Design an enzyme around this catalytic site. Structure first.
Site, short mmCIF file in Angstrom:
data_model
loop_
_atom_site.label_atom_id
_atom_site.label_comp_id
_atom_site.label_asym_id
_atom_site.label_seq_id
_atom_site.Cartn_x
_atom_site.Cartn_y
_atom_site.Cartn_z
N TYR A 64 0.79 -1.23 0.00
CA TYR A 64 0.00 0.00 0.00
C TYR A 64 0.83 1.28 0.00
CZ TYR A 64 -4.38 -2.53 0.43
OH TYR A 64 -5.45 -3.35 0.16
N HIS A 151 -22.01 5.83 2.24
CA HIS A 151 -21.38 4.86 1.37
C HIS A 151 -21.95 5.02 -0.05
CE1 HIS A 151 -19.49 0.67 1.02
NE2 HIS A 151 -19.96 0.95 -0.19
N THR A 163 -25.91 -3.57 4.60
CA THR A 163 -25.11 -4.71 5.01
C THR A 163 -24.56 -4.57 6.43
OG1 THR A 163 -23.07 -3.83 4.02
CG2 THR A 163 -24.46 -5.22 2.64
N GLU A 221 -16.00 -1.37 9.79
CA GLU A 221 -17.09 -0.60 9.19
C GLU A 221 -18.42 -0.94 9.85
OE1 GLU A 221 -17.51 0.63 4.94
OE2 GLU A 221 -18.80 -1.14 4.84
C1 LIG Z 1 -25.16 -3.60 -4.19
C2 LIG Z 1 -24.05 -2.79 -4.83
C3 LIG Z 1 -23.02 -2.23 -4.00
C4 LIG Z 1 -21.61 -1.77 -4.63
C5 LIG Z 1 -20.51 -1.36 -3.57
C6 LIG Z 1 -19.92 -2.52 -2.74
O1 LIG Z 1 -18.96 -1.77 -1.93
C7 LIG Z 1 -18.47 -2.53 -0.83
O2 LIG Z 1 -19.43 -2.45 0.23
C8 LIG Z 1 -19.05 -3.23 1.37
C9 LIG Z 1 -20.22 -3.23 2.34
O3 LIG Z 1 -21.33 -3.93 1.80
C10 LIG Z 1 -17.75 -2.68 1.97
O4 LIG Z 1 -17.95 -1.34 2.39
C11 LIG Z 1 -16.65 -2.72 0.90
O5 LIG Z 1 -15.48 -2.10 1.40
C12 LIG Z 1 -17.12 -1.99 -0.37
O6 LIG Z 1 -16.15 -2.17 -1.42
C13 LIG Z 1 -15.17 -1.19 -1.54
O7 LIG Z 1 -15.80 0.07 -1.82
C14 LIG Z 1 -16.53 0.08 -3.07
C15 LIG Z 1 -17.18 1.45 -3.19
C16 LIG Z 1 -15.59 -0.22 -4.24
O8 LIG Z 1 -14.62 0.81 -4.36
C17 LIG Z 1 -14.90 -1.56 -4.02
O9 LIG Z 1 -13.95 -1.79 -5.05
C18 LIG Z 1 -14.19 -1.57 -2.66
O10 LIG Z 1 -13.67 -2.87 -2.41
O1 LIG Z 2 -6.17 -8.57 2.86
C1 LIG Z 2 -6.26 -7.40 3.24
C2 LIG Z 2 -6.91 -6.32 2.56
C3 LIG Z 2 -6.90 -4.96 3.23
N1 LIG Z 2 -6.28 -4.75 4.48
C4 LIG Z 2 -6.27 -3.40 5.13
O2 LIG Z 2 -7.54 -2.76 4.89
C5 LIG Z 2 -7.35 -1.39 4.45
C6 LIG Z 2 -8.47 -1.03 3.46
O3 LIG Z 2 -8.69 -2.13 2.59
P1 LIG Z 2 -8.81 -2.28 1.02
O4 LIG Z 2 -7.60 -1.66 0.41
O5 LIG Z 2 -9.04 -3.74 0.74
O6 LIG Z 2 -10.09 -1.34 0.83
P2 LIG Z 2 -11.32 -1.36 -0.20
O7 LIG Z 2 -11.06 -2.17 -1.42
O8 LIG Z 2 -12.45 -1.70 0.68
O9 LIG Z 2 -11.39 0.16 -0.76
C7 LIG Z 2 -5.97 -1.37 3.81
O10 LIG Z 2 -5.36 -0.09 4.01
C8 LIG Z 2 -5.18 -2.41 4.64
O11 LIG Z 2 -4.49 -1.85 5.73
C9 LIG Z 2 -5.65 -5.82 5.13
O12 LIG Z 2 -5.09 -5.69 6.22
N2 LIG Z 2 -5.67 -7.06 4.49
#
Ligand SMILES: CCCCCCO[C@@H]1O[C@H](CO)[C@H](O)[C@H](O)[C@H]1O[C@@H]1O[C@@H](C)[C@@H](O)[C@@H](O)[C@@H]1O
Ligand SMILES: O=c1ccn([C@@H]2O[C@H](COP(=O)(O)OP(=O)(O)O)[C@@H](O)[C@H]2O)c(=O)[nH]1
Ligand SMILES: [Hg+2]
Ligand SMILES: [Hg+2]
Ligand SMILES: [Hg+2]
Ligand SMILES: [Hg+2]
Length: 263
Positions: A64, A151, A163, A221
């Site tokens: 990261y 979100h 969720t 979250e």
């Molecule tokens: C039903 C359609 C929803 C599309 C967004 C899903 O987002 C993910 O939501 C979960 C909770 O249900 C978590 O908050 C997760 O971190 C979210 O994914 C991340 O954020 C979204 C906006 C997108 O950037 C993903 O690539 C991330 O992994």
């Molecule tokens: O296998 C994983 C994936 C993510 N993270 C931690 O979770 C934070 C946010 O996660 P991610 O990058 O997966 O976020 P998203 O795809 O939800 O935007 C990162 O900064 C990491 O510190 C972790 O510890 N292990």
């Protein structure tokens, strides 16, 4: 404290809503920040007169660290420009932090991986993830004692579809008939006191959960959502503040895409 100076700007229109396509205030009277709801000149004046300092925290471990350059460069162009900013980068690779050129009145601290420090160095704390980039203005309009961000994937969803953690055995549990919004676990903030209050509560709740052999569906979250349900935020940021254009496009309801995930 001190009085604002004479300012010339359009008079607010009592009989004209500032956005008729979205909710701009919560049931507990906290504003929901959308483009068009605020006059940044007035807000900038109010916060500069208080010599406000904003701390921005990010964790960058392992791979990261590669996202730090873009994160910091764009923050320099869009985050709290004109105000005092202190970046706090928590990383396991200190020597790998990019040498980014900062504007005046802004500084960066690298912490290898002291909560009292925050209380003496900044007025507000903003907590986000590093694999993001600023694309537009993110300023003092977000500052308040405690704020959460809607979100991007669920702002138009009914509470039953949220969720949230649904198992009563978890401290993050929220039943189907409860809940205001689904907040992001990766973009929240407020005064140092309120932010530490939230993280402390989250940390304790997660310890209780692990002791009972359970892990919330969306981890931190899920707990943040439980916290903001029971402790209403004083401001709520619209999805303009954390968007994913690749997955969600660019809806008419969004006049600006300010902070986005990096594909
Ligand atoms: C039903 C359609 C929803 C599309 C967004 C899903 O987002 C993910 O939501 C979960 C909770 O249900 C978590 O908050 C997760 O971190 C979210 O994914 C991340 O954020 C979204 C906006 C997108 O950037 C993903 O690539 C991330 O992994
Ligand atoms: O296998 C994983 C994936 C993510 N993270 C931690 O979770 C934070 C946010 O996660 P991610 O990058 O997966 O976020 P998203 O795809 O939800 O935007 C990162 O900064 C990491 O510190 C972790 O510890 N292990
Ligand atoms: Hg933080
Ligand atoms: Hg919590
Ligand atoms: Hg936590
Ligand atoms: Hg939390």
């Amino acid at each position: 404290m001190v009085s604002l100076p004479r300012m010339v700007y359009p008079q607010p229109k009592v009989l004209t809503p500032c956005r008729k396509d979205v909710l701009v205030v919560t049931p507990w009277l906290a504003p929901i920040v959308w483009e068009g709801t605020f006059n940044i000149d007035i807000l900038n004046e109010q916060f500069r007169l208080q010599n406000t300092t904003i701390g921005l925290t990010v964790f960058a471990i392992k791979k990261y660290v590669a996202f730090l350059k873009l994160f910091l460069e764009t923050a320099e162009k869009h985050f709290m420009v004109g105000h005092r900013v202190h970046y706090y980068v928590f990383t396991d690779q200190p020597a790998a932090v990019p040498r980014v050129t900062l504007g005046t009145g802004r500084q960066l601290s690298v912490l290898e991986v002291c909560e009292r420090r925050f209380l003496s160095e900044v007025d507000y704390l903003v907590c986000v993830d590093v694999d993001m980039e600023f694309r537009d203005h993110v300023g003092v309009e977000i500052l308040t004692p405690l704020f959460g961000t809607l979100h991007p994937g669920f702002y138009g969803s009914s509470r039953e579809a949220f969720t949230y953690e649904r198992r009563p055995q978890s401290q993050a549990y929220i039943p189907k008939d409860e809940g205001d919004f689904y907040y992001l676990g990766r973009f929240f903030g407020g005064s140092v006191q309120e932010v530490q209050r939230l993280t402390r509560a989250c940390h304790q709740a997660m310890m209780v959960d692990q002791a009972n052999g359970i892990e919330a569906v969306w981890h931190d979250e899920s707990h943040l959502n439980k916290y903001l349900l029971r402790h209403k935020p004083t401001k709520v940021l619209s999805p303009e503040y954390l968007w994913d254009q690749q997955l969600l496009g660019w809806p008419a309801v969004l006049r600006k895409l300010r902070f986005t995930a990096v594909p």
